[PDB]
Design a protein around this ligand. Structure first.
Ligand code: HEM
Length: 184
């Protein structure tokens, strides 16, 4: 179940966030913690491609090796808050599971600057959801969370100490695929 109406950053700069570059998840918190593994790897690219607002996602379970990519065109609900219907693709953008009604995520940018961000997502996959999932992002996959983003975690009435880091999982990413997938 998702339970939070995440508030988007006041003054969110959409063009900076959606600049075509990659964001790495460094830390995450699911309010239903058993919905996701204790060890995980994830990243995304976010950009406008031929006028269309896009995200490309990458998930990797470092223990099971379960791997998947997704592409979505985001619809705007308000500045910094989006609804994304996703398609599972291979790294080259070939469709494995087409877009469908019931497959979407919400995506709220709670805080962002040039290097760091805090997001909330609620994933819906038919009648399943994966809970309220918060993620700390950085442009540098190895960056420890700094004071701007940690303060934003506090401002959301969360505790950064409870987030799970992705940093000790040997995560290696294909940035080229993420960038190219924005067009797909
Ligand atoms: C920016 C952040 C994230 C977004 C927008 C997001 C989005 C999604 C989407 C769209 C799917 C469905 C993929 C498909 O079936 O095509 C998915 C699945 C999944 N995500 Fe995420 N995710 C994010 C971060 C994470 C993180 C950090 C974790 C783990 C800690 C995670 C764990 C999972 C798992 C385990 C699944 C598979 C669910 C299933 O097998 O049905 N995700 N996510």
């Amino acid at each position: 179940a998702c339970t939070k109406n995440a508030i988007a950053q006041t003054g969110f700069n959409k063009d900076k966030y959606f600049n075509g570059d990659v964001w790495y998840v460094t830390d995450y918190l699911d309010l239903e913690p058993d919905d996701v593994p204790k060890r995980y790897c994830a990243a995304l690219a976010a950009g406008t491609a031929s006028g269309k607002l896009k995200e490309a996602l990458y998930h990797y379970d470092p223990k099971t090796q379960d791997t998947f990519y997704d592409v979505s065109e985001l619809q705007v609900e308000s500045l910094g808050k989006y609804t994304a219907n996703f398609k599972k693709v291979d790294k080259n953008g070939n469709v494995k599971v087409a877009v469908t009604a019931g497959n979407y995520y919400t995506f709220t940018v709670m805080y962002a600057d040039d290097s760091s961000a805090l997001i909330h997502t609620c994933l819906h996959k038919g009648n399943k959801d994966l809970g309220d999932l918060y993620a700390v992002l950085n442009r540098n996959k190895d960056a420890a969370a700094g004071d701007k983003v940690k303060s934003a975690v506090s401002a959301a009435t969360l505790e950064f100490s409870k987030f799970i880091s992705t940093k000790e999982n040997n995560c290696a990413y294909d940035n080229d695929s993420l960038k190219s997938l924005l067009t797909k």
